[PDB]
Design a protein around this nucleic acid. Structure first.
Lengths: 134, 149, 137, 99, 64, 214
RNA sequence: AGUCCCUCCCGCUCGGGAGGGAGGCACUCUGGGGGGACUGCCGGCGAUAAGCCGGAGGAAGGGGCGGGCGACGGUAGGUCAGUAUGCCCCGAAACCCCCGGGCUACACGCGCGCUACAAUGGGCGGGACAAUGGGACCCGACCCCGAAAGGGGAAGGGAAUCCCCUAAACCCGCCCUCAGUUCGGAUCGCGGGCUGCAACUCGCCCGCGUGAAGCUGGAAUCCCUAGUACCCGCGUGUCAUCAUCGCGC
């Protein structure tokens, strides 16, 4: 039984494939245990720790992530892994735990960049040039 | 165990130490009097930076191979301090990369793919994989979570 | 070996707490890059603290600075890659460097070149804009 | 094989030509690869509104969108004659090549 | 005396030069005047049921 | 430098940073108890998501609040310790990884030097540095008056965290002390109630002005 | 992503990984048509209406979030130097072309910005992750030459096929330890290149050499309510060369 899931964050798209194995989680082929920085590693690891050791050491996950930055890719992989785990075990209690801990693991993040505008564009939609007044 | 199971820097330093033995990889006569890119302010502070650079180039050919001088230069470029002007990104020099790749080819770790670039040969692949396996065996003791991999 | 607090290399007293790299920079006409170059050609570790230098090593640095090109330094890491008078590659330091620069400025002034005039008036010489900047008075 | 690339500034004309080609293929009985919608090309030009320099700067962004469809068919006499007999409206451009 | 806690039980409205201070009614939880209802001024975002540490429970804020 | 074990630390339980647990952390002030969030949380990083709501930061973990407050320059329109600290390109703004590392080092130093829970010490510092009263201008009739007002629990927490961060920045500014050392020293001093701490000194200043103007 | 074949590598291959072919579109993606969010439901306030506050469900709760569209008029506000145009004027000159110079001058006052006044760092080696857009006298992978700038040949691409294009901030390891310093990079000397018919007035780049104020800024004053502000880089418009700029990512 091979299960596929998707996660999206900003411009980061992650496709996660989960199957039966020993507990090998790889992000782009590189083990999750040596993810740098620790901030991104913790973001990726949180859902597995929440699920528990038993489920963690019972599935193998391979995640391919493209686009975004080192945090966007990590969060997209987090979402994909959370969804894959939830759909694989089919545990409503686990889904409820995930929802109470962080609604965003299963539900995506709609937030995107707001297009820039004139009057000192290239800085932000609302950033404006200083006015002389005299 | 392979390259993908080992941190890049810990593997690169070990590969440099091992490559110091091979006689086909020697610093050029102009190595002591050169910087590593027009964007760099001061020349290296290692006295053996040649082996580290060659190891990095070999690992790059292993991972993203086939590749070429221009793309490796893009990788090895970086930000420059232009003074009062805003900072900007520039590429790196080409002689260092070209000589490193030629020395690797002479050693037999890389080979030319015509019109595409340079790709790692089985000999170099085995060399890198052996170094990575040794490093992973060393690391497994500190980090038990890497045993299953 | 003897650890001298202050050492003399080229008529300038260098510190003893700094590495040879940054110690050699106290001499006018030698920057960090050229100091590392000279240390490497002489064969000394650039990172050794100044003061451990011996008389033989100081003498080696002496004639290295006297004629860097003939002893391995590249032809393009020199203060005067092509001298106006001799036409050779010469590296100058302190008094000789100042004399050469003054000779060049006096050359421009004597020949009445635009740069010579700008040097005399003290205004910027490399075609900058004087409307809003370079306000000294 | 024959590859046809059809591009226009009007989605309705684009779809009309695509439907005509699909009907021709269906009536001839030849298997046809569905219309591939290639990414739209958006030419954007930002221009200052004022003809002079006075006043706060304001800009307008004029955009021209061009839509592209691709179709692949297997060459046949009747099918290719019928395709060459296409209407090809004024605002649509058609290119045919053989492989 | 380390302050006295009082629970906010009703909000009157906003007040101040820039409308920063909210007038509320508070019941004293502990102290010599336990259970007394007073009207006091509050600075910052305040809800119902919040606990405010008043240094003293003598003065009462003026009406809106 | 640091051990490979610390470099590749792998948590296995749900606790703050994967190293310290808040089960034993105790908050006394009844005013501030409903607003100091101590729920289980491995990574204190919510990617905002609480600004949209009102009182939405009352459910953000205290360590995340501290990291956000530390992520700043120090001063741009207000003078800190009689100086400005306008760090333009070297500030920690938009560097949550750097703020996170600094807070981790500060907590490690606090635990090493005190022997107690760093989060408990931080809680104590907040309790000690939270002011209880202030003053403001209120207009009745046709003129203004300098009246005395109370501070709501959320404003108290905000002031305490702000003062702690500002004190750490001031201590670290152009000094041999690193940012982590400055933050640890500031937190410990605030916990110990020593007036040297910027947080405690500013709290006492606000308190005395409010008492005088009441 | 699953499945078959070939090749290679590792702990000697149980097991794991990479690439190429067949094959698939399963996921991402592109782009056409549709659904969904409607105070629709619950509690309260208001008067039973207009409506307002909170709550459940939900991706999106109250104009869903950001933009385009600027009313009758005024402002004798700006534009005849973008084109059109009344009147006045030159009409062989104020018309039309060629070289050279100027718009780039510099005791000084001002606006908006860049770099900085350091450890919330500088340097050195190594390790990661984007998007928007453009390409015919054009983009140019790839190989050889050079220390850098740059030079020679040249595949592919009128474009989801090739290229611009392996960004920086960030993370690791080492040196520096509070100092006008290994901070700061103005200002000049020498030498090597590129564009261009032409580089001195008056271009940009590169190596070595020197190292000017500046150690946080009075009165006063500016922008910003959420992926927004702040930091970090990149695309394009101008272009033979030149971006501390505008518009975007």
């Amino acid at each position: 039984r091979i299960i596929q899931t998707t996660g999206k964050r900003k411009t980061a798209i992650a496709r996660a494939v989960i199957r039966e194995g020993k507990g090998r989680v790889r992000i782009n082929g590189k083990p999750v245990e040596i993810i740098e920085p620790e901030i991104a590693r913790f973001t990726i690891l949180e859902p597995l720790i929440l699920a528990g050791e038993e489920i963690w050491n019972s599935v193998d996950i391979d995640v391919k992530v493209e686009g975004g930055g080192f945090m966007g890719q990590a969060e997209a992989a987090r979402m994909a892994i959370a969804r894959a785990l939830v759909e694989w075990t089919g545990d409503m209690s686990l889904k409820e735990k995930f929802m109470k801990y962080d609604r965003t693991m299963l539900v995506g993040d709609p937030r995107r960049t707001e297009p820039h505008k004139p009057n000192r564009s290239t800085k932000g939609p609302r950033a404006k040039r200083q006015k002389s007044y005299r | 165990a392979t390259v993908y199971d080992v941190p890049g820097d810990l593997l690169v330093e070990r590969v440099a130490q091992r490559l110091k033995e091979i006689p086909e990889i020697k610093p050029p006569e102009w190595a002591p009097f050169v910087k590593t890119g027009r964007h760099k302010e001061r020349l290296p502070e290692q006295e053996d930076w040649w082996y580290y650079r060659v190891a990095s180039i070999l690992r790059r050919v292993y991972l993203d191979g086939p590749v070429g001088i221009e793309r490796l230069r893009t990788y090895y470029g970086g930000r420059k301090n232009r003074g009062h002007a805003p900072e900007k990104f520039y590429k790196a020099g080409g002689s260092i990369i070209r000589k490193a790749l030629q020395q690797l080819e002479a050693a037999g770790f890389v080979e030319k793919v015509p019109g595409k670039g340079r790709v790692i040969t089985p000999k170099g692949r085995s060399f890198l994989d052996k170094i990575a396996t040794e490093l992973k065996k060393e690391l497994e003791e500190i980090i038990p979570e890497l045993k299953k991999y | 070996a003897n650890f001298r607090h202050i050492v003399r290399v080229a008529g300038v007293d260098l510190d003893g707490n700094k590495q040879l790299r940054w110690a050699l920079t106290a001499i006018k006409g030698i920057g960090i890059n050229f100091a590392t170059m000279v240390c490497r050609v002489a064969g000394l570790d650039p990172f050794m603290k100044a003061g451990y230098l011996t008389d033989e090593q100081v003498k080696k640095i002496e004639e290295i600075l006297a004629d860097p090109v003939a002893h391995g330094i590249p032809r393009w890491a020199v203060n005067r890659p092509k001298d106006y008078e001799t036409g050779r590659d010469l590296h100058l330091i302190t008094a000789k460097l100042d004399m050469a620069i003054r000779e060049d400025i006096m050359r421009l002034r004597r020949i009445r070149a635009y740069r010579g005039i700008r040097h005399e008036l003290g205004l910027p010489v490399r075609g900058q804009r004087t409307r809003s900047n370079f306000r000294r008075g | 094989k024959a590859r046809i690339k059809i591009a226009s500034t009007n989605v309705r004309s684009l779809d009309e030509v695509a439907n005509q080609i699909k009907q021709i293929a269906e009536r001839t009985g030849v298997r046809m690869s569905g219309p591939i919608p290639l990414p739209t090309k958006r030419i954007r030009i930002t221009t200052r509104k004022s003809p002079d320099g006075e006043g706060s700067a304001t800009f307008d962004r004029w955009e021209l969108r061009v839509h592209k469809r691709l179709i692949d068919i297997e060459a046949d006499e009747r099918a290719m004659r019928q395709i060459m007999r296409i209407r090809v409206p004024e605002d649509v451009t058609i290119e045919i090549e053989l492989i | 005396d380390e302050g006295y806690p009082a629970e906010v039980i009703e909000i009157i409205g906003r007040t101040g030069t820039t409308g920063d201070v909210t007038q509320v009614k508070v019941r004293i939880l502990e102290g010599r005047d336990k259970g007394r209802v007073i009207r006091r001024n509050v600075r910052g975002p305040v809800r119902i049921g919040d606990i405010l540490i008043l240094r003293e429970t003598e003065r009462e804020a003026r009406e809106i | 430098a640091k051990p490979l074990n610390e470099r590749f630390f792998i948590p296995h339980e749900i606790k703050v940073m994967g190293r310290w647990s808040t089960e034993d952390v105790e908050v006394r002030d009844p005013s501030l108890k409903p607003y100091i969030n101590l729920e289980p949380r491995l990574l204190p990083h919510t990617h905002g998501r609480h600004a949209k709501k009102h009182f939405g930061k009352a459910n953000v973990h205290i360590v995340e609040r501290l990291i956000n407050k530390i992520m700043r320059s120090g001063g741009s329109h207000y003078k800190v310790a009689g100086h400005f600290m306008r760090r333009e390109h070297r500030s920690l703004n938009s560097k949550k990884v750097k703020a996170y590392e600094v807070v981790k080092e500060a907590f490690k130093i606090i635990e090493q030097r005190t022997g107690k829970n760093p989060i408990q010490v931080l809680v104590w510092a907040i309790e000690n540095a939270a002011p209880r009263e202030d003053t403001t201008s209120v207009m009745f009739g046709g003129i203004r008056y300098h009246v005395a007002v109370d501070i709501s629990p959320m404003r108290r927490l905000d002031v305490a965290l702000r003062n702690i961060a500002l004190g750490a920045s001031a201590k670290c500014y152009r000094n041999k002390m690193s940012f982590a050392e400055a933050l640890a020293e500031e937190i410990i001093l605030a916990a110990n109630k020593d007036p040297k701490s910027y947080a405690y000194s500013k709290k006492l200043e606000i308190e005395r002005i409010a008492e005088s103007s009441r």
